[model samples]
Target: AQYEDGKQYTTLEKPVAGAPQVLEFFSFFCPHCYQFEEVLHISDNVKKKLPEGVKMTKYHVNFMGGDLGKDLTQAWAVAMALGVEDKVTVPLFEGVQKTQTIRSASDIRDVFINAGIKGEEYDAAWNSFVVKSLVAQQEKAAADVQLRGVPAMFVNGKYQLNPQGMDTSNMDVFVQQYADTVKYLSEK
Candidate 1:
């Protein structure tokens, strides 16, 4: 694993230190982000290689679809707040880019509804403080990072990834190197 600081990753000026968290910045509207999670299974593969107890947190970006972008971020938080991420994540992704059914907020509601969250339950989750606070933080995190692209990863909210140097042609090599880089920077 190549652990060169500037080549593969950049350390943040104001870093987080609570726990080693891999914050993945993605967008429900991004086909690449959808491919990363669904087709390549990048996060799941990388998660397999991370050190024990190192958690992976995903942040749905709110700049891709205008007002609907913000709604999707809230939808992501709502899924988590209701403890149904495994239930809604893939469906939401497909709904947005694959099935092409998520054109508005109501479409997002259908995803939650299909995931077994009733209309009222979904509404309550959307309005809940837990979900609202998460969405607020997601937006703030995006603003703080001043992101230039989607499908980005931050280790402990400090180390920013530079994927240009990785071997993306092979999934195994890519996962090994990606996870190694993340594991190395996470300790800093």
Candidate 2:
């Protein structure tokens, strides 16, 4: 995914005190997010090196058209609800991208099933908490923030202006900068 210049980003208007929250606003369908996944692993390493109070949250931007966005959004919420977010996040991304198939809501649910999440439970999560509130929140965030593209990241509620666009090098720098900022904010 290419990040265009001069695009206005909506910030996450919540206080992240005591612990600096690293909120990643990204789209799962985005190739840049897929590519940035590697750098994010490095960022994870950087995260491990830091002190406590550095909570990371991934908010999948659902501005992309079609059911892919819906599936990804549901997957995110369901995983969070199931308390398997850490385990399912990477697998879900890999399943969609590696299979060379555009992941739909059903397809994503299937992935959840394969991941040991039951179909009924998945459906319950989707219909009950996942789709209902999460979708609304995604829309509110997108509309309120007025985001132009996907995979925009926020550090401590402020957008971490992508310096080199979506380039991995640029993303690497951005992650490190954000990590440092998170650490600094955590201490303050």
Candidate 3:
């Protein structure tokens, strides 16, 4: 799929340093975001195709606020702070979407614990100033993007991949389009 500028994706005024940034905006509670997890499995393949400096990060959107959104956002921040995103991301999504088990902070903590994150480690990361700060930053990032929905991809903070506008139902094509789009943008 060829991603046309200003349509499939847009350019950022200032890209992040050292690499183009691939930011996926998502929420654990969002059903659509849960369905989008299929794309994440191919992330390694996409990364291999990206330019040397390009990097991908997940941004937990807190637009819903309140207990559910806040707790999940905090959990994601903790996962990132502890460098356990790779360990907990999918399970967290599953815990919410498949099992329908995650509802509060305790549930999130249990998910981390089951994922091999020790109690102390989860506590430290969950309560750390860093996690709190990162969560705040994520909220701002979402607002900055004028985020409308979950599972949205933003490349280099400039271009947003319109998943809904992709004109395809095939997940492979959807993933490939993003991989190719990121590679193209990084080269430029």
Candidate 4:
């Protein structure tokens, strides 16, 4: 919905490492993102099959239509900027998956607090420049990619893996396919 015609767009901050990072674009409200989580949890199994130097970087896509969307987006930014992404990623996922509603700022903030993040730290990170920049960066990526929906993935910025037409049960298979695709592309 943020797509405005004819405007130029830019890519998000590139990954610093040379390791091939699988960029998974998803949203908190997306059912597909929810489903993908189960398969992704089997990362060890997948990694054993992967070519070396391959890893995943989850990107939370937010168009921010409502308060919930905005809050989730803010939470993502805070987590990333504070170097706490590894700490909060799973908790954020579980909070949404296990709880009744993650559709409020207070609720989402509470989720972070319950995950050992301090209220002051959360507030500071929320207002920090890094968080603001990251949010803008994500917005730009969504625009640059002309994203149609959540759970779309870009492998090394060279290929896109969108499962819009696939059967739901095939998600894990698709994820494996995506990893293999990246491996193939990197070789060429």
Candidate 5:
């Protein structure tokens, strides 16, 4: 798979860390992001495929700013804090897009509960200072990176992949292209 530097992905001015970083900018409310979750199986396959020493992080887009945005962003932070992000990320997306089960904080809590998190543990993480702080940090990171949309990918703080440019006409081709690009960039 061939990719143009400024077209398929753009290089960042500074890498996010000393090591490579793969950061995904996503929102639970975005249907296309939800679909991408299915395509990527990020928590499992993508994570497994990532090269060693490369860190993977997902940032929930705090674009809307209302309760919907804040609540979902907090939900994601909570999941990440509890180390259940891999288990719950896709469910959260499906909860909003398919089942319509995650419209509010209460609903999000239910999703966690169903995922086997005890109520008290969930509450503590959900309202913890760390989660709140991380939420703010991630929001600022999104802005600092100049993210224009959801389901965007940043490999090593450079090589930003705009999902819109992906060839989604055939998912197999798209996935292969994405995988190749990611592997190639990570090795660099």
Candidate 6:
């Protein structure tokens, strides 16, 4: 639980209402985000060990990939609404970052279709108000943070973890420290 206020994390202008929440903000186009979520598997490590009552949330950043950023973010929101994150996340990342196959929103839809979600089901969620709200919320959240980079994580929507302040040289320590830091900040 060792962390400095300004260096390790900075407090938001206003604390988000929900206590013990983790709002993870990143883009599919982010190499480090891919490395964290897919390669090093840091999320898998930190996610399981978080304290009880701690709610985890994610936002696909709307700042990357220019116009396509909105499309990808919308895709993530739709995936969440459809409860098919596990089925679609890896494939979308692979298509976007690894294979370079996804170039348009239709390609994103294909990832969902490939993951077993039917075309109509995907369309319904994609057009639903709830998913649109989620996308709008993501845009506001990203704009509020005035983010300079990807893979930034926030605790309770108020405190952002600084990657540079972290000792990323060692993967094990980084994961352990991430858990500890989240635990510490959640209680604040």
Write the residue-wise lDDT of candidate 4 on 124-143 in tens digits: 88989888998987776666
lDDT of 1 at 133: 95
Every candidate's lDDT = 0.83, 0.61, 0.75, 0.62, 0.76, 0.82
Model 6, 82-141: lDDT tens digits are: 888888889988999999999999999999998899999999999999999989888787
- Scored by lDDT, the top model is 1
lDDT, residue 130, model 4: 83
Candidate 1 residue-wise lDDT, 5-46, digit = tens:
778898778766552388888998898888888887778877
Considering lDDT, which of the candidate structures 5 and 6 is the better prediction for this target? 6
What is the alpha-carbon lDDT for the whole of candidate 6?
Answer: 0.82
* Candidate 2 C-alpha lDDT tens digits along 1-188: 22222332333455334322555566667777776674465347446656765666666766664667766876787777788776676776677677645446777777778789888888888888555686666555555456677665555554444434323455556666545544544443
> Which ranges in model 3 have alpha carbons more than 4 Å from their true place?
11-20, 39-42
Single out the weakest 10-residue window by summed lDDT for candidate 4.
Answer: 1-10
lDDT of 5 by residue, 73-162 (tens): 988888888889867876887888888877788988998999999999999998899999979878877877777788777777767764
Candidate 5 residue 47 C-alpha distance from true site, Å: 3.1
TM-score order of candidates, top first:
6, 1, 5, 3, 4, 2
Between candidates 3 and 6, which one is better according to lDDT?
Answer: 6
- Candidate 6 has a TM-score of 0.91
lDDT of 3 by residue, 82-125 (tens): 89888888888888778888878898899889989999989988
**Candidate 3: deviation at residue 126, Å?**
1.1
Write down the TM-score of every candidate: 0.90, 0.71, 0.85, 0.72, 0.87, 0.91
